[PDB]
Amino acid sequence: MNVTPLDELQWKSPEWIQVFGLRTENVLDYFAESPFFDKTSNNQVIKMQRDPARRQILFKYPMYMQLEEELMKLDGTEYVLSSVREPDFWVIRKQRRTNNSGVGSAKGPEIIPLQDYYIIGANIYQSPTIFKIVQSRLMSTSYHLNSTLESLYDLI
Amino acid sequence: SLYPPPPPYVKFFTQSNLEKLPKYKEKKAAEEITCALDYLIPPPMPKNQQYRAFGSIWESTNYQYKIQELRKLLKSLLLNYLELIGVLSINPDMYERKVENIRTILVNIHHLLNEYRPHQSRESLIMLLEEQLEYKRGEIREIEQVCKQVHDKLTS
Amino acid sequence: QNPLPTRFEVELEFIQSLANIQYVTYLLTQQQIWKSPNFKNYLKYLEYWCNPPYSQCIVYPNCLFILKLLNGFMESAIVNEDGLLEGLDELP
C-alpha cells in the first residue's frame, strides 16, 4: 500500500475525451485530483440529485462567474457588511494553464482574506505545496549528501 | 539485454480497464480477441494435453457498383436541390418532400463512401509498398553509383 | 520452424522465466515498469497459473512461489517517484 500523498500526478486523457478548455476544466479537476470532498461537489450533487477583495482582484469571465454566485449562496456566514464561506473550491487562470483554491473568506470594508488550499493546474496535473515543507526538502537532501561528503573524508 | 521485456499485453492492464472488468465479465457470460479487456482474462487451456508438464525442474462486395450508386445519388441529390431552389418546377405540397429526399440522399451517400474504406485502405497499402519498394531500389542504385564513381576516381 | 507463440504460450513461457532469480532481479531494479501499475497488475493477473488446470502445465514450480512472494511484496512495496522500488534501494 503506497500513497501518492503531497500532490503527484493527474487524471489524464479520460476527460481529455470529455474535453478540457477552462470552465469544464474545474469539473475535470474534480475527478482527477480526488480532492472535491464537500461543498463544490455537494452543490453539484444536489442539483444532480433529482465582490470579495480577492474576487475583485480576480474578476470572473463566463459561466463559472454564474456558478460563483451559486457557491456564495451555498456557503455564506453573514455579518453586517461581510460574508464568509465554508468549503468552496475555485480558480485563477491564463491561456495554456490556471491555478485554483478551495477556501474560506473573511470580509471587511478595507480588507478581505480567504484561507483555503490553493492548487495550480497545467496539462492534467495538480500542484498543492508548502514552504517550510518546501525547504525541508532539498535542505535535508543537501545535508545527507554533505554527510556522504564528510564520510568520504575517510582519507588519511 | 538478452533478458526479454514483459509481454506486450501489459499495456492493457490499466486501473481503468480493471474497473471495467467485472461488468465486462458479466456481459460476456450472456483465439477470439476483440477488445482490450479480453487480455485481462486468462487464455483458455489448449486441447492437446501435451502442455501438461512432464515433470519438475527445481462473395465480392462489388465496388464498381457502389460507385454507380454514388454517382446516381449525386445527380438525384442535385436535381432535388435544383427543385427546392426553384430552378426546376414543383408544387409546394412537395417542397418539404424535396427536403426529405435531400436528407435521405445525403445519408445513403455517407453510408457508401463509408463502405468504401476497405477497398480504399488496400489502394493505400498497395501505394505504400509501391513507394518503399521504389525507395529501396533507389538505395541500391545509389550504392551502385558510388562503386562506379570509385572506378572513375580510380582511373584518371 | 514454428509459427509465433500463442498468448497462452507467451504467458506460460513468461511466468516460468520468473523462476530465474537473476532475471526477477533485473526486473525489480528496472525503472520504467514500476512508474505505472500495469506491470504490477499483470503479475497479479498471472496468478491464474497457480490453480488447475493451469498449474498442471508448470514445469518450473519455483516460479509460482516467486510470483507469490513477488506479488505480496508489491502490495506493501513503496514506489519511489522515478520508478525505483524503495525497499530495495540499498541493494545493487
Binding site: 503506497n2 501518492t4 503527484e8 500526478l9 493527474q10 487524471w11 489524464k12 479520460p14 482527477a32 480526488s34 526538502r137 | 490499466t14 486501473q15 481503468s16 480497464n17 480493471l18 474497473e19 | 512508474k35 505505472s36 501499475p37 514506489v79 519511489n80 517517484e81 522515478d82
Partner: peptide, 25 residues
Amino acid sequence: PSYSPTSPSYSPTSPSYSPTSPSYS
C-alpha cells in the same frame, strides 16, 4: 554583498521528486 554573483546550477535531470499512481481512469 555576500560574495558577488549568484552560483547557477539549475537542474531537471536530477534524481526525481514526482511519483505516479493516478494514471488509471
